[PDB]
Amino acid sequence: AVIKEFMRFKVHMEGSMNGHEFEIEGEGEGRPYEGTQTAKLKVTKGGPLPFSWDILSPQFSRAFTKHPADIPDYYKQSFPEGFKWERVMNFEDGGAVTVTQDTSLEDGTLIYKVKLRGTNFPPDGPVMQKKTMGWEASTERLYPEDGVLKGDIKMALRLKDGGRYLADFKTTYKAKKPVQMPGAYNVDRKLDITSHNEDYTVVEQYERSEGRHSTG
């Protein structure tokens, strides 16, 4: 009831990558039951970023995933209070990122607060040299544990040279009130940068995601 067929969000991120501090502010919109959303982000401090935007893009919205009727939606049920999440991203070349997020609702608008710390990225690696070209489509394997939902993703960034750059994502999602827990299930997702200015200080992105049962 609280999550309408069309919803907007506002987001603020404070982060650091290999010690370079930055801030991002943005706004987004989408269709939570259709699984689609777009966001427009601006770098407000530390721009232009000396690293790939692709590290940031998965940190900007779990209310917007399409679910079949028989899978309870952990995220939508958590409103109006909302949910938190905490993530580690471990990259194949030793780069590591921790992210924490709070999702709440104010005056009918979703409010996202993100903190990000990335370290140990090789100075000549694809992240610090901006050689990545977006994420491959992915499948997050979600499972319940003790009132929280945990997710694992094998993620891959495309490289400008045609190669790939792999990461493991581990996330815990925590509703702020009791909800009906789903069984373990999968979320298929595609995230794309759809526009940007020359130095990626203004960036638009789009995500489509849909939950489904595992086939085994």
UniProtKB/Swiss-Prot annotation:
Domain of life: Eukaryota
Pfam family, one: GFP
Family annotation (Gene3D superfamilies): 3.30.1300.40, Green fluorescent protein
Keywords: Chromophore, Luminescence, Photoprotein
InterPro entries, A to Z: GFP (IPR009017), GFP-related (IPR011584), Green_fluorescent_prot (IPR000786)
Practical uses of the protein: Fluorescent proteins have become a useful and ubiquitous tool for making chimeric proteins, where they function as a fluorescent protein tag. Typically they tolerate N- and C-terminal fusion to a broad variety of proteins. They have been expressed in most known cell types and are used as a noninvasive fluorescent marker in living cells and organisms. They enable a wide range of applications where they have functioned as a cell lineage tracer, reporter of gene expression, or as a measure of protein-protein interactions.
UniProt-listed SUPFAM superfamilies: GFP-like (SSF54511)
Family, similarity comment: Belongs to the GFP family.
Assembly and interaction partners: Homotetramer.
Protein name per the record: Red fluorescent protein drFP583
